[PDB]
Symmetry: D2
Subunit: 115 residues, 4 copies
Amino acid sequence: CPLMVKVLDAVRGSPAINVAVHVFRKAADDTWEPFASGKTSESGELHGLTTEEEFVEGIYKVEIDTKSYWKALGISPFHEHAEVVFTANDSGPRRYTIAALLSPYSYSTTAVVTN
Amino acid sequence: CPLMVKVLDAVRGSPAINVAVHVFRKAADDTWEPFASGKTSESGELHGLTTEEEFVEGIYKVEIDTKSYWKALGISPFHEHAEVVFTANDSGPRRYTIAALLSPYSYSTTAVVTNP
Amino acid sequence: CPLMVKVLDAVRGSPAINVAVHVFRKAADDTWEPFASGKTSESGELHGLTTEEEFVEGIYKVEIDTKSYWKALGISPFHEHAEVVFTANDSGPRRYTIAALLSPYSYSTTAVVTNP
Amino acid sequence: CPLMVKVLDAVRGSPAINVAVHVFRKAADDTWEPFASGKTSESGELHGLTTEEEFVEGIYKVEIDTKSYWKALGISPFHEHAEVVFTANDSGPRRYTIAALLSPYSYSTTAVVTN
Ligand SMILES: *B(O)c1ccc(/C=C/c2cccc(B(O)O)c2)c(Cl)c1
Ligand SMILES: *B(O)c1ccc(/C=C/c2cccc(B(O)O)c2)c(Cl)c1
């Protein structure tokens, strides 16, 4: 698990369950090609998106469908989705956790990058 | 205005209006003495808490009554309040904005510190 | 001023000054068309991006160039930028403030939406 | 583990390691009595603070010594510490994770409350 995504709900104080997540890698023509996707688990987590062989250096975009998550809960959301765009850098063995904390009109995201 | 408090609502996408704020200052005997208090306005801002003369070096606690705020909107929030504790003016007088972004089970706070 | 962007620095406790901001609008062919751009001022605010006439219903993307900002301070940040994507004015014209609080490996964003 | 504390570093993108955490419970005279404490692990986590028998309903304060954490890294911090004050409510079996994401002039905290 070179790449994990974790999503939390700031309104209900819970994991954000069954949230669609799409990962894209930037191509040479500078467009976003699908790379991996899934739905978050009961623990708000999404594992097994990629493997260390496939997860090469490059720019990646993690898109979290926050709008559908809120809509299914009956709450009026602001954002179309939440997007996290970052460079994967090989300099040193790294595991990446992309965490997002969601509110209807706000979100915050952080990266936890470890050996 | 050496100390201003700004409060936003992350559920409604609006200023957080009518939020009670209490400020304390740590006294010599190490207890929290009441220093100033007020209510955020329609813009979510609380001005006029203190003056440059009164706002001396010290350790201050800004306690924002988040629970009352959420309860009136029908939500039973996690936190009793949000408190922000910091040393002020120890390198000379500064202007401090204490900003908070509120959700029922979460909040964020940041400080903007400027030199007049 | 129907659209304003405000950017704060969580490491320095200050406005984030000289941050490039690019705004796009989703066109009919579903591509992102350049809509407006600018630089945050000394107060971390970016005013004057658009007008009530120009700022029609649509899906907008506000892209904040966080990486350039951190790089100039010597920090190699995690994110390429912060992007904020939202439908605007679909219930009539509103005023939008897009606020962001920046750290090298993290950021938060919130929207304040008011009705004039 | 009825109560867990997790602390992350937003500047370095890592767990906040070896951070002192103090938990207090509010007493009848409305003063804060020490309840539990520890230092965060290598994963920025602090487990085993209490047990379900001891963790009764009441108001608790979690104090995170953020100032010492930043000082030991050579970074000038704003806050004296970060404090999280909440009511533990029995209505339903609950596990509490108090998470905090730290910057030198800012922090955010959320509660993840699950069965
Ligand atoms: B939590 O991660 C968080 C707290 C606070 C803010 C916003 C602060 C703000 C917004 C508009 C104006 C001012 B001011 O200096 O008058 C401050 C965010 Cl985005 C996130
Ligand atoms: B502030 O706006 C903020 C606070 C906390 C988080 C996420 C915390 C987290 C990350 C990974 C795992 C767990 B856990 O419950 O084991 C919690 C963010 Cl993104 C932002």
